[PDB]
Write a protein that binds this ligand. Structure first.
Ligand SMILES: *[C@@H]1O[C@H](CO)[C@@H](O[C@@H]2O[C@H](CO)[C@@H](O)[C@H](O)[C@H]2NC(C)=O)[C@H](O)[C@H]1NC(C)=O
Ligand SMILES: *[C@@H]1O[C@H](CO)[C@@H](O)[C@H](O)[C@H]1NC(C)=O
Lengths: 223, 218, 103
């Protein structure tokens, strides 16, 4: 998170920290609990083995609020496009149901084809880098505004407003960044977006997967 | 060197191994008791101060009291261009002078402007990879090569082992090409991969930098 | 069955970079060639962003930049088939930044 603030610990109990491991490498992503047995995240975070940490604030400490669970299944959208980063959504079926409490509980999804007007204030949270030189051990968050689609359509030639959300004011140094993929765009306490991609510089605007465009698939996959 | 042969012990006492953290990364040539000559790309992205110059070696896997080891005092380059791989030569001054003996001797260099022609018979050598997952060579390798001109640019001396897949490989950069007993080349780069059998190996043309080298070591 | 070094890398294609934080495994305390590392970069480009050898050939530009532990950098043109004939330490690479532009 660039230009944000340290989160109040456990103020965002749906947040998940993902450690992804494959023979050739590793990745770190965010995610969010949507049911006691499922986490939503980005498809480009997929890998051979995924460890999910719920209930965390400082991921460099073994806090006792933390619940660690492996992904039994990691279900990338069947039409995920790695070239353009489209249909960038993935469901993780957890190997056990979480123990729901104050520090670990799911977040609501939007209604079918629910829309977001430009100017709407949202919050994005995660453990990603805060600059080109530094990262964070603790959860951070930043408030961002939904944009008119044209702001992204000229910069990102594969942006599709039917499936993606354009977020962030180009003049601000406030954005999600490396390590924040998979985390939620929270607007009015509902998860409308998933952090997906942007510019290497981290300058806004950036692109989020539009959760409401994938509810049928989400529902079908979780049943 | 791929498809070469194990050199005779101390056959080429001007041959040098440059090592870093216990690893041979390039070859070099003893050109003066206190100067060795290598390829510029071999030092452009490393901390010189940790590089060790090893003379009189033959089997890097074995302990050899025959060997002399020196650190690098200073370097001297003349316009190495990384984008086009031109002027790929460096001189390293040592933290001492070699004791010339049965295992260690100063090489001999050709005259400024001398150009070898197609068909000239030369020898390459080095401790680079042996090819096809055999790994890096323990014992110094040597390979008969022929100078070619096709698929070459004048900024280089190019070589080819005609008739079979062999040539220089990784770990051989900076090793000498010799030829008529004169060090005419310093291994610089390959194309496609080692021992392609279709692309020549490219050597820095030592006979094009003779003036500067003498300006350094006199 | 042996230890590995974890080198951060980034991939940008046509001005789009995914916001994961990813690392490339290299065998620790090992030596590598530019052919080896370039091949690993091409494999990453394909498996992470679907970038093919054909796309690299037709691209306006296709490069990766190594930042070394000493602080120097080396830009490698993936469209070129020339490789310097040296070996380098896996422990000396600090970061890799891959950038492909089709333009
Ligand atoms: C490979 O190269 C070596 C060294 O240049 C050749 O051995 C020399 O052969 C010449 C005659 O061609 C002799 O006059 C020298 O005395 C030899 N020198 C040494 C150190 O042995 C060898 O003949 C070459 N082989 C081929 C097939 O060209
Ligand atoms: C030069 O460096 C080598 C290797 O570090 C060392 O063995 C030798 O004693 C040094 N000699 C001088 C004069 O610094």
């Amino acid at each position: 998170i660039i230009g944000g603030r340290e989160s109040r610990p456990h103020s965002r109990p749906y947040m998940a920290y993902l450690q992804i491991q494959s023979p050739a490498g590793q990745s770190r992503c965010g995610g969010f609990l949507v049911r006691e047995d499922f986490v939503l995240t980005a498809a480009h975070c997929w890998g051979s083995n995924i460890n999910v940490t719920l209930g965390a604030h400082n991921i460099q400490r073994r806090e006792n609020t933390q619940q660690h669970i492996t992904a039994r299944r990691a279900i990338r959208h069947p039409q995920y496009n790695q070239r353009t980063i489209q249909n960038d959504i993935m469901l993780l079926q957890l190997s056990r149901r979480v123990r729901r409490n104050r520090n670990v509980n799911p977040v609501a999804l939007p209604r079918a084809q629910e829309g977001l007007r430009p100017g709407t204030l949202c919050t994005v949270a995660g453990w990603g880098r805060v600059s080109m030189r530094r990262g964070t051990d603790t959860l951070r968050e930043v408030q961002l505004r939904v944009q008119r689609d044209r702001q992204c359509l000229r910069i990102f030639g594969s942006y599709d407003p039917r499936r993606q959300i354009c977020v962030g004011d180009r003049r601000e140094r406030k954005a999600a960044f490396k390590g924040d993929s998979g985390g939620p765009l929270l607007c009015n306490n509902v998860a409308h977006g998933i952090v997906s991609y942007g510019k290497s510089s981290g300058v806004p605007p950036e692109v989020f997967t539009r959760v409401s465009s994938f509810l049928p698939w989400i529902r079908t996959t979780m049943r | 060197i791929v498809g070469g042969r194990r050199a005779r012990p101390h056959a080429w006492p001007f041959m040098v191994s440059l090592q870093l953290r216990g690893g041979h990364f390039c070859g070099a040539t003893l050109i003066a008791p206190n100067f060795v000559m290598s390829a510029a790309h071999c030092v452009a992205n490393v901390n010189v101060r940790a590089v060790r110059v090893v003379l009189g070696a033959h089997n890097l896997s074995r302990r050899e009291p025959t060997r002399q080891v020196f650190a690098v005092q200073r370097i001297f380059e003349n316009g190495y261009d990384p984008v086009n791989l031109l002027n790929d030569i460096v001189i390293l001054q040592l933290n001492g002078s070699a004791t010339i003996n049965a295992n260690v001797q100063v090489a001999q260099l050709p005259a400024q402007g001398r150009r070898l022609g197609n068909g000239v018979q030369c020898l390459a050598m080095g401790w680079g990879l042996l090819g096809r997952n055999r790994g890096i060579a323990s014992v110094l390798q040597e390979l008969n090569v022929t100078v070619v001109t096709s698929l070459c640019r004048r900024s280089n001396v190019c070589t080819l082992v005609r008739g079979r897949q062999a040539g220089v490989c990784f770990g051989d950069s900076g090793s000498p090409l010799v030829c008529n007993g004169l060090i005419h080349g310093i291994a610089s780069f390959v194309r496609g991969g080692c021992a392609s059998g279709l692309y020549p190996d490219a050597f820095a043309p030592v006979a094009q930098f003779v003036n500067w080298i003498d300006s350094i070591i006199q | 069955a042996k230890e590995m070094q974890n080198v951060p890398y980034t991939i940008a294609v046509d001005g789009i970079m995914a916001f994961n934080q990813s690392y490339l495994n290299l065998p620790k305390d090992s030596q590598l060639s530019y052919l080896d590392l370039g091949n690993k970069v091409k494999a990453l480009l394909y498996d992470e962003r679907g970038v093919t050898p054909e796309k690299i050939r037709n691209a306006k530009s296709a490069v990766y930049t190594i930042t070394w532990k000493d602080g120097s950098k080396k830009e490698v043109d993936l469209k070129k088939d020339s490789y310097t004939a040296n070996l380098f330490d896996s422990n000396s690479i600090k970061q890799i930044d891959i950038n492909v532009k089709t333009k």
